[PDB]
From Swiss-Prot, chains A, B:
The lineage of its organism: Eukaryota, Metazoa, Chordata, Craniata, Vertebrata. The keyword Kinase does not apply. The gene is PNPO. Ubiquitous. Expressed in liver, brain, lung, prostate and stomach (at protein level). Its EC number is 1.4.3.5. It is an enzyme of class 1 (oxidoreductase). This is Pyridoxine-5'-phosphate oxidase. GO terms for cellular component: cytosol; mitochondrion. Its cofactor is FMN. It is linked to Pyridoxine-5'-phosphate oxidase deficiency: The main feature of neonatal epileptic encephalopathy is the onset within hours of birth of a severe seizure disorder that does not respond to anticonvulsant drugs and can be fatal. Seizures can cease with the administration of PLP, being resistant to treatment with pyridoxine,. Pyridoxal 5'-phosphate binds at K50, Y107, R111, S115, R175, L176, H177. GO terms for biological process: pyridoxal phosphate biosynthetic process; pyridoxamine metabolic process; pyridoxine biosynthetic process. Belongs to the pyridoxamine 5'-phosphate oxidase family. Homodimer. It comes from Homo sapiens (Human). Catalyzes the oxidation of either pyridoxine 5'-phosphate (PNP) or pyridoxamine 5'-phosphate (PMP) into pyridoxal 5'-phosphate (PLP).
């Protein structure tokens, strides 16, 4: 194996720490979120991990965006972390729950005022006429919210992905990449991890 | 807009060139491929772009892997290119066609012998007992194929994604990210690109 922990959330923590300390990785928490329609049309985009633990992986967005519409209709997702300078990939699959509105509100107000105003101004993924449109509306909302709290948009909040599958991939120069996959659940190549996790090695 | 071309495949080419010339990007052709089951369970993983043009985006894999099973069942995919040092993202969505077997064979034999043997040895995403298993089988196949052509596995080949949607995202320090989305297909904020493409600007 060559693992730090047989709890894959703690293995993730170990790798995440190493990615944060790597000077050649800009945002260690950048990840690709894949969603799809119930009818099976996939979509995917980058966003930032904003909290993780036993309960899973947290991220925030406008619920009226493509990703929010798909998660609300079809609450299953996949994440990919790719840390090229360390030749490492982490894949996560699992169901998603929307975060309580109180938790989203508290998180929203912990962010810089410019980010809060950014969320108000931008109906994420709606059509706009040009660049200047955005700059102008942002400055008008800056005026509106001088010395005042910015309210969280009704359409803004978070989700938590509860992991059911987690794969750790370490690339190798000889092409025989190390892949260790954890799944929640015995064959001779299948092994018991912590809690209800099982793990096995996969061919690259 | 701030674009090089209103054909989004040529816009992609322009950005791809800039990513290749960036010394802080290791593999400019690394991309995240999102697929899903017909029933709407998404999955996603990194792989390499291996050709692109008017017909679309080409990639190669074992058809018996998760991605191959999903594409064969449900031939729709999404790609994400993320070039952190340039603060750029490209998203592509479209249908997939499997490449002709003759084209796959010719491509397979153009690769280094070690890569060809790697494809034979590794039933991608099947379970294996340990690291040494892989090293040993690789060396045995090296013996078998000394001074001899390696046959392409029946289960190995490629796919081409024909783009229907392409988004170009340029991150900005002020958070008002530039997003220009091209779709194949008139509102006042929707514009004609080349061929059957339309484009518009989206809120970040
Ligand atoms: C590094 C990076 C991080 C991002 N983080 C987020 C985020 O944390 N939340 C978010 O809503 N969008 C984020 N985006 C923007 C998304 O790529 C996307 O433009 C947006 O969320 C709309 O996606 P959708 O239309 O597919 O739902 C990020 C983009 C980049 C490049
Ligand atoms: C940078 C990078 C490039 C990769 N390129 C490929 C590839 O080109 N073809 C491929 O089959 N797997 C590639 N992989 C491995 C995939 O991440 C994955 O392990 C494998 O294809 C099996 O995926 P699946 O089980 O989801 O189908 C790559 C991994 C990394 C980190």
């Amino acid at each position: 194996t060559h693992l730090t922990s047989l709890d894959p959330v703690k293995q993730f923590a170990a790798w995440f720490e190493e990615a944060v300390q790597c000077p050649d990785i800009g945002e260690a928490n950048a990840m690709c979120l894949a969603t799809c329609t119930r009818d099976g049309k996939p979509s995917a985009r980058m966003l930032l991990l904003k909290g993780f633990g036993k309960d899973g992986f947290r991220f925030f967005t406008n619920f009226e965006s493509q990703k929010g519409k798909e998660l609300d209709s079809n609450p299953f997702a996949s994440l990919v972390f790719y840390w090229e300078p360390l030749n490492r990939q982490v894949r996560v699959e699992g169901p998603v729950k929307k975060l309580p509105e109180e938790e989203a509100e508290c998180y929203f107000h912990s962010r810089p005022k410019s980010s809060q105003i950014g969320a108000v101004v931008s109906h994420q993924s709606s059509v706009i006429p040009d660049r200047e449109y955005l700059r102008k509306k942002n400055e008008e909302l800056e005026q509106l919210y001088q010395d005042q709290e910015v309210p969280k948009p009704k359409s803004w909040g978070g989700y938590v992905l509860y992991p059911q599958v987690m794969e750790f991939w370490q690339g190798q120069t000889n092409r025989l990449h190390d892949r260790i996959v954890f799944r929640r659940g015995l064959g001779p190549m299948t092994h018991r991890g912590e809690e209800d996790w099982l793990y096995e090695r996969l061919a690259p």
